[PDB]
Amino acid sequence: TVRKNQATLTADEKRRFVAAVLELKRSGRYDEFVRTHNEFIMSDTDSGERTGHRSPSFLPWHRRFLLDFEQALQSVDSSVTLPYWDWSADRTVRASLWAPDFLGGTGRSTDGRVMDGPFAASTGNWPINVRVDSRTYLRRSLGGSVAELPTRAEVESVLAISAYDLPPYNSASEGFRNHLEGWRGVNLHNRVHVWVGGQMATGVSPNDPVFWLHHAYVDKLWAEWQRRHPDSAYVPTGGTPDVVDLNETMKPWNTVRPADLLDHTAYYTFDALEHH
Amino acid sequence: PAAPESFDEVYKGRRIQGRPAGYEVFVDGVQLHVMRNADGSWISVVSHYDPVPTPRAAARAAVDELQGAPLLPF
Numbered sequence: 001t002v003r004k005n006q007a008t009l010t011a012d013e014k015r016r017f018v019a020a021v022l023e024l025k026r027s028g029r030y031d032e033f034v035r036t037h038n039e040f041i042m043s044d045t046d047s048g049e050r051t052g053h054r055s056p057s058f059l060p061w062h063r064r065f066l067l068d069f070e071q072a073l074q075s076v077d078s079s080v081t082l083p084y085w086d087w088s089a090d091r092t093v094r095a096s097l098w099a100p101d102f103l104g105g106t107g108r109s110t111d112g113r114v115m116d117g118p119f120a121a122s123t124g125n126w127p128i129n130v131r132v133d134s135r136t137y138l139r140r141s142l143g144g145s146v147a148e149l150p151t152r153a154e155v156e157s158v159l160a161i162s163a164y165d166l167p168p169y170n171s172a173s174e175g176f177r178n179h180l181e182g183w184r185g186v187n188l189h190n191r192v193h194v195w196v197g198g199q200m201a202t203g204v205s206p207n208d209p210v211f212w213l214h215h216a217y218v219d220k221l222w223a224e225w226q227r228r229h230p231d232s233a234y235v236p237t238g239g240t241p242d243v244v245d246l247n248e249t250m251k252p253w254n255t256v257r258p259a260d261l262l263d264h265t266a267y268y269t270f271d272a273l274e275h276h
Numbered sequence: 277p278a279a280p281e282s283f284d285e286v287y288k289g290r291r292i293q294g295r296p297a298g299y300e301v302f303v304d305g306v307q308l309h310v311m312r313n314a315d316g317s318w319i320s321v322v323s324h325y326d327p328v329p330t331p332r333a334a335a336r337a338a339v340d341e342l343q344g345a346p347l348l349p350f
C-alpha cells in the first residue's frame with residue numbers, strides 16, 4: 001500500500017478514490033466512521049479519560065482510524081489507498097484538491113453549501129446524516145475563519161521538537177504531539193480543520209472526505225518526526241491514569257496498542273519520506 | 277477552578293444561555309456540547325478545534341456557525 005500526495009494522483013486514481021468513498025457512503029458504512037470520531041471527540045477531556053485527541057494517543061489513534069477507513073475502501077476497490085494533503089504546499093482554493101474531479105471547492109457564501117464536485121448535496125450522493133448543525137448538505141468556507149494554512153517553516157519548527165509528548169499529556173502539554181495537534185504553538189492540525197470550515201470544523205469532521213487526506217498528512221508528519229528523532233519514542237511508558245501508555249490497548253478496538261502502530265511500514269509506505 | 281458565571285442574552289437573533297452544572301450551554305433552549313481546555317479556553321462541538329476564551333464566546337461561535345439553523349440535541 002503506498003500513500004501518495006493527492007497532487008500527484010492520476011485522473012483514474014481520483015475517479016477510483018471518489019467511487020470507493022461514495023460506495024462506503026451509500027452502504028451506510030461511512031457514517032459510522034463519522035459517528036465514532038464525534039463520540040470520541042465529545043468524550044476525550046483534559047482532566048479525565050482521553051484517547052483520540054488532546055493526548056499522546058491522538059497520533060496512533062488516528063493512524064488506526066485511518067487504517068480502518070482505508071481497509072474499508074480497499075474492500076470496495078483494492079487499488080485505492082488514502083492520499084495525503086500537504087497543506088503547507090497546496091495552500092489555496094486553486095489547489096487541484098478542490099477541483100470538481102476530486103473534492104469539489106469551497107461553499108457558497110450564503111449558507112456554506114458546496115456546489116460542485118462529487119460530494120455536493122445536489123448530486124444526491126452525499127447526505128449529511130450524522131450531524132449536530134441541523135443542515136444536511138456538505139459545507140465549507142476555505143480560509144473563512146482563519147486566514148492561512150500552516151507554512152513549511154512552521155511545520156519545520158514543530159518537527160524539530162524532540163520530545164514526543166510531556167506531562168500532563170493533554171491540551172496544555174509542551175512537546176511534539178501537542179504542537180502538531182495544535183493546542184499550543186503556531187498550530188498545525190487544528191488550524192487546518194478551522195481553515196476548511198463547514199463540517200470539518202466540528203466533531204462530525206469526517207463528514208468531509210478531506211478529513212482523511214488531512215489526517216493522512218498529519219500521520220506522515222509523525223513518520224517524518226520519527227526519522228528526525230530516532231532517539232525519541234512514544235510516551236508515556238506505563239502507569240499513567242486516564243492516558244494510553246505505550247503498551248496499553250486503545251478504544252474502540254481494544255486489541256491494539258500504541259506500540260503496535262509506531263511503525264507505519266508494517267501497513268503502508270509513502271511515495272516519499274525523508275531518511276534520518 | 278470554579279466555573280464561569282452564568283449568562284443569558286440574545287445574540288444575532290438567537291437566545292444563548294450558559295450556566296454552571298461542568299458547564300451547560302443552550303442555543304434557543306437546545307443544549308450544545310461544550311468543553312473546557314486545561315488552559316481555561318472553551319470549544320463547542322461545532323467549533324471543536326478552535327479555542328475561544330469563554331463559554332459565551334463558544335455559544336456565540338456556535339450561533340455564527342449555524343447561520344440560522346436549529347441545533348440538533350446531542
Ligand SMILES: [O-][O-]
Binds near residue numbers: 215
Ligand atoms: O481529528 O479530526
Ligand SMILES: [Cu+2]
Binds near residue numbers: 205
Ligand atoms: Cu478530530
Ligand SMILES: [Cu+2]
Binds near residue numbers: 041321
Ligand atoms: Cu467536546
Ligand SMILES: [Cu+2]
Binds near residue numbers: 189193215
Ligand atoms: Cu483532526
Ligand SMILES: [Cu+2]
Binds near residue numbers: 276
Ligand atoms: Cu543521527
